[PDB]
Design a protein around this ligand. Structure first.
Ligand code: HEM
Ligand SMILES: *[C@@H]1O[C@H](CO)[C@@H](O[C@@H]2O[C@H](CO)[C@@H](O[C@H]3O[C@H](CO)[C@@H](O)[C@H](O)[C@@H]3O)[C@H](O)[C@H]2NC(C)=O)[C@H](O)[C@H]1NC(C)=O
Ligand SMILES: *[C@@H]1O[C@H](CO)[C@@H](O[C@@H]2O[C@H](CO)[C@@H](O[C@H]3O[C@H](CO)[C@@H](O)[C@H](O)[C@@H]3O)[C@H](O)[C@H]2NC(C)=O)[C@H](O)[C@H]1NC(C)=O
Ligand SMILES: *[C@@H]1O[C@H](CO)[C@@H](O[C@@H]2O[C@H](CO)[C@@H](O)[C@H](O)[C@H]2NC(C)=O)[C@H](O)[C@H]1NC(C)=O
Ligand SMILES: *[C@@H]1O[C@H](CO)[C@@H](O[C@@H]2O[C@H](CO)[C@@H](O)[C@H](O)[C@H]2NC(C)=O)[C@H](O)[C@H]1NC(C)=O
Ligand code: AIN
Ligand code: CA
Length: 595
C-alpha cells in the first residue's frame, strides 16, 4: 500500500517534451515520471528510516529510550574522543592538491541540500534554543560533555535545528519524516544558476540580449568579474569584520560564501559562463539572449560532469571505480536519479580532507604578502579578503600548489572545523562540524553502520575483535566500542570514515559502495547526460573531451602557469607549464549556418 499522493509544496509546471534544455527545477528530465530528480522534494530512501518513536523523533532525543539496548553517546563526546587531534604536522596528502577537496564540495552542493527549519522570522525559539538549550520541537541541541573546555567558555550546549521535511514544515506527524533536497539531483550546474525559477532569473543579466549572468558593479578584479553582492542584511560576511562591511556573494546556491575557497570556485564558474556566452554570440550573431544563456549553460553542465567523472571520481573510488560505475551504456529511464538521504552523509568524507590553512601565492608561487598563510576559521564567510586583499588569483594559485589533508584514523577533522566553525545565524567561531554531522545523522533517521555494511554486502562485526579486523586498528575500534557498545549503533558518518582506504582511493569499502551507487544512478538516469546521443552532436563531444580545469583557470584568471593534472599534487615550477600549451575548448562545432 503505497502513498505517493503527498506533495503540493513543490513548484510544479507543465513540460515541453522536445525542448533541448534542462528546466531550472529539474522537472521533466524523466518523461514517464516528470518530478523525478526535481528540486524541493524528498531525498530518496534506500532503507527505511530509523527513528526513536519510529516516525520522527531522533535517537538520543529521549535520554531514556535506548537504541538496541544502549544509550547513544553524545555527538560531541564522539567528536572529542575520536575525531579531534592537535598536531597538524605530517597530515597533508602527498598526492592530492587542495583543489581535490574543493571540487568535492562543489559536486556535493550541486547534488544536495537539506536546509534547516524555519518558523524563525522574528522568533524566540531562535533564542529559547541558543540561550537556554531547552530541547523541543525543531531545537535539538548538542550538549557538552563533562570536562569539555567549551563548558567553561561557551555554555551548556551548541544550538542546532532539525532539517526540513516534506508535505508541511510546522507541527506535523503521520508518515515517516522525510527530509527535503532543495536542489536538483542531476549533476547540472544548479549551483551556478540556481534550482528555482525566481533565483535563476535574478541571477541573470536581463538588461541586455547577451545571455550573460549578472556581475558585481562595485568592484572588479583586474577587469575580471565578481559574483554580485547579496541584497539581504543582516549579512554574516559583514559581521566578521564590521569595518570592511563586505557582504556575502549572491549565487545559484546559498552556501557559496561558507569559505573563501568555495567562493573562489563559484566565481571561476560564473566567469566561464560569460566568457562562453560572449564567444557564442561571436559565432552566431543572430542568436537571442535566451539561446545564448541556455546554450552556454548546457556547455558548463557538460563541463562539470566531465571533470567529475573523468578526473575526480577515479581518484576517490580508486580501484573500486569500475566495480560500481561501469562504462556508460546510454540513458536508462528505469534508473531512479534521486539523491538518497544517506548519500548526503557519505559525501561528507570531504570534511576530513580540509587542512587547517589557506595560502595566497604571488606570481612566482611565493607567499603573497607577510600574513600570507591564514587559519581556515578566519575565512568562513570571509568575502572581504577577496575584494580588498588581492582578488582570486592568489587563492587559485594556492589551490594548485597546496595539498589537501589526508584522512587519518588518529587525525580525522582539523580543530579549525572541530572547535571554531562559524554559523550564519550565530555570533561565534565555536561550532563543531563533526558533532553537527553526527547530530544530523540522527535527525535524518539513519540506520546504523552495520545496516549499511549489510546493504553493501560487507561483513557486519558484532564484537570488538570483529571491529578491530574491519577497521584494522585496535585502538580506534576500542574507542568506538566504549562509546557505542555495539557496532550496530555506530553512526554511518564516523563508521564509514573510520575504514581504511581502498587501493588508489580516498574512501573505504562502505563509502565506495555508497558513493559509487549514487553516481552510477545520477549518470544513467539523466536524460541530459553529456554522452547521451542526441544531447550533443558527435562533433561537440569530441570538443568537450579536451576540457581541463587547468584550462578553465587559464581563460578566467591572469595565471599563465598551471599544472596539467590539477588534482594530483604538483610542485612549482617543475610540474607547471605555460597556458599557451594547454588544450582549449573548440566552439566552432557550435556554429549554426542558414540558407
Ligand atoms: C567549512 C566546510 C568545508 C571546508 C572548509 C566543507 C567541505 C566539504 C567538502 C570538501 C565536501 C565533499 C567533498 C563536503 C560535503 C558536504 N558538506 Fe561540508 N564543508 C564545510 C561546512 C559544512 C556545514 C556547516 C554543513 C552543514 C551541516 C549540517 O548538517 O547542518 C556542511 C554540509 C555538507 C553536506 C550535507 C549537504 C546537504 O545535503 O544538506 C555534504 C555532502 N558542510 N563539505
Ligand atoms: C598520484 O596520483 C596519480 C593519479 O591517481 C597517479 O598517476 C596516475 O597513474 C595511473 C595508473 O593507472 C595512470 O592512469 C591513466 O593511465 C593511462 C595513461 O597512460 C590511461 O589510459 C588510463 O585510463 C588512466 O587514466 C596515470 O599514470 C596517472 N593518471 C592520471 C590521470 O594522470 C600517480 O602515480 C600518483 N603518484 C604516486 C606517487 O603514487
Ligand atoms: C577588516 O578589513 C580591513 C580592510 O578592509 C583590515 O585592515 C586592512 O588590512 C591592513 C591592515 O592590517 C591594511 O593593509 C596594509 O597594507 C597597507 C598598504 O597601503 C599598509 O599601509 C599597511 O601595512 C596595512 O597594514 C589595510 O589598509 C587595512 N584597511 C583598513 C581600512 O584598515 C582589517 O584588519 C580587518 N579586520 C579584521 C579584524 O580582520
Ligand atoms: C549586463 O550586461 C551589460 C552589457 O554587457 C553590462 O554593461 C556594461 O558594463 C560594463 C561595466 O559597467 C561596461 O562595458 C559598460 O558600462 C556596459 N556596456 C554596455 C554595452 O551596456 C552591465 O554591467 C551588466 N549588468 C549587470 C547587473 O551585471
Ligand atoms: C536499466 O536499469 C534497470 C534498473 O536498475 C536494470 O534492472 C536490473 O536488471 C535485472 C535484469 O533484467 C533485473 O532482473 C533486476 O530486477 C534489475 N535490478 C534492479 C536492482 O532493479 C537494467 O539492467 C538496466 N537495463 C539496461 C539495458 O541498462
Ligand atoms: C557549507 C554548507 O554546506 O553550509 C552553509 C551554508 C549556508 C550558510 C551557512 C553554512 C554553514 O553552516 O557554515
Ligand atoms: Ca544539481
Amino acid at each position: 500500500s503505497w502513498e505517493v499522493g503527498c506533495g503540493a509544496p513543490v513548484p510544479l509546471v507543465k513540460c515541453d517534451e522536445n525542448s533541448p534544455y534542462r528546466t531550472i527545477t529539474g522537472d521533466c528530465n524523466n518523461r514517464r515520471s516528470p518530478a523525478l530528480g526535481a528540486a524541493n522534494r524528498a531525498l530518496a530512501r534506500w532503507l527505511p528510516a530509523e527513528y526513536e518513536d519510529g516516525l520522527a523523533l531522533p535517537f538520543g532525543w529521549t535520554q531514556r529510550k535506548t537504541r538496541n539496548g544502549f544509550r547513544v553517546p553524545l555527538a560531541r563526546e564522539v567528536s572529542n574522543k575520536i575525531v579531534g587531534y592537535l598536531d597538524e604536522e605530517g597530515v597533508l596528502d602527498q598526492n592530492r592538491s587542495l583543489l581535490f577537496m574543493q571540487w568535492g564540495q562543489i559536486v556535493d552542493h550541486d547534488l544536495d541540500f537539506a536546509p534547516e527549519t524555519e518558523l524563525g522570522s522574528n522568533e524566540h525559539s531562535k533564542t529559547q534554543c541558543e540561550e537556554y538549550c531547552i530541547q523541543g520541537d525543531n531545537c535539538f541541541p548538542i550538549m557538552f560533555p563533562k570536562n569539555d573546555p567549551k563548558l567553561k567558555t561557551q555554555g551548556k550546549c551548541m544550538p542546532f535545528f532539525r532539517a526540513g521535511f516534506v508535505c508541511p514544515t510546522p507541527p506535523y506527524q503521520s508518515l515517516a519524516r522525510e527530509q527535503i533536497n532543495a536542489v536538483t539531483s542531476f549533476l547540472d550546474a544548479s549551483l551556478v544558476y540556481g534550482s528555482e525559477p525566481s533565483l535563476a532569473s535574478r541571477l541573470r543579466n536581463l538588461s541586455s540580449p547577451l545571455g550573460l549572468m549578472a556581475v558585481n558593479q562595485e568592484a572588479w578584479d583586474h577587469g575580471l568579474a565578481y559574483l554580485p553582492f547579496n541584497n539581504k542584511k543582516p549579512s554574516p560576511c559583514e559581521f566578521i569584520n564590521t569595518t570592511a562591511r563586505v557582504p556575502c556573494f549572491l549565487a545559484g546556491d546559498f552556501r557559496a560564501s561558507e569559505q573563501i575557497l568555495l567562493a573562489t570556485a563559484h566565481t571561476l564558474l560564473l566567469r566561464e559562463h560569460n566568457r562562453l556566452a560572449r564567444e557564442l554570440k561571436k559565432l552566431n550573431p543572430h542568436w537571442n539572449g535566451e539561446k545564448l544563456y541556455q546554450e552556454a549553460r548546457k556547455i558548463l553542465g557538460a563541463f562539470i560532469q566531465i571533470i567529475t567523472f573523468r578526473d575526480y571520481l577515479p581518484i576517490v573510488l580508486g580501484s573500486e571505480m569500475q566495480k560500481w560505475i561501469p562504462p556508460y551504456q546510454g540513458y536508462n529511464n528505469s534508473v531512479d536519479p534521486r539523491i538518497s538521504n544517506v548519500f548526503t552523509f557519505a559525501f561528507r568524507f570531504g570534511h576530513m580532507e580540509v587542512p587547517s590553512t589557506v595560502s595566497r601565492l604571488d606570481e612566482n608561487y611565493q607567499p603573497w604578502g607577510p600574513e600570507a598563510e591564514l587559519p581556515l576559521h578566519t575565512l568562513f564567510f570571509n568575502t572581504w579578503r577577496i575584494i580588498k586583499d588581492g582578488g582570486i588569483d592568489p587563492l587559485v594559485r594556492g589551490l594548485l600548489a597546496k595539498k589537501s589533508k589526508l584522512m587519518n584514523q588518529d587525525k580525522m577533522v582539523t580543530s579549525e572545523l572541530r572547535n571554531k566553525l562559524f554559523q550564519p545565524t550565530h555570533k561565534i567561531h565555536g561550532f563543531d562540524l563533526a558533532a553537527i554531522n553526527l547530530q544530523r545523522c540522527r535527525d535524518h533517521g539513519m540506520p546504523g553502520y552495520n545496516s549499511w555494511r549489510g546493504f553493501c554486502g560487507l561483513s557486519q562485526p558484532k564484537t570488538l575483535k570483529g571491529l578491530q579486523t574491519v577497521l584494522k586498528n585496535k585502538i580506534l575500534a576500542k574507542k568506538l566500542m566504549d562509546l557505542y557498545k555495539t557496532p550496530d549503533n555506530i553512526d554511518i558518518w564516523i563508521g564509514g570514515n573510520a575504514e581504511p582506504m581502498v587501493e588508489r582511493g580516498r574512501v573505504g569499502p562502505l563509502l565506495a559502495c555508497l558513493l559509487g551507487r549514487q553516481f552510477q544512478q545520477i549518470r544513467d538516469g539523466d536524460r541530459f547526460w553529456w554522452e547521451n546521443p542526441g544531447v550533443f552532436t558527435e562533433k561537440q563531444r569530441d570538443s568537450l573531451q579536451k576540457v581541463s580545469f587547468s584550462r578553465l583557470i587559464c581563460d578566467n584568471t591572469h595565471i599563465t602557469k598551471v599544472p596539467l593534472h590539477a588534482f594530483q599534487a604538483n610542485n612549482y615550477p617543475h610540474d607547471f607549464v605555460d597556458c599557451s600549451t594547454v588544450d582549449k575548448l573548440d566552439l566552432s562545432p557550435w556554429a549554426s549556418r542558414e540558407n
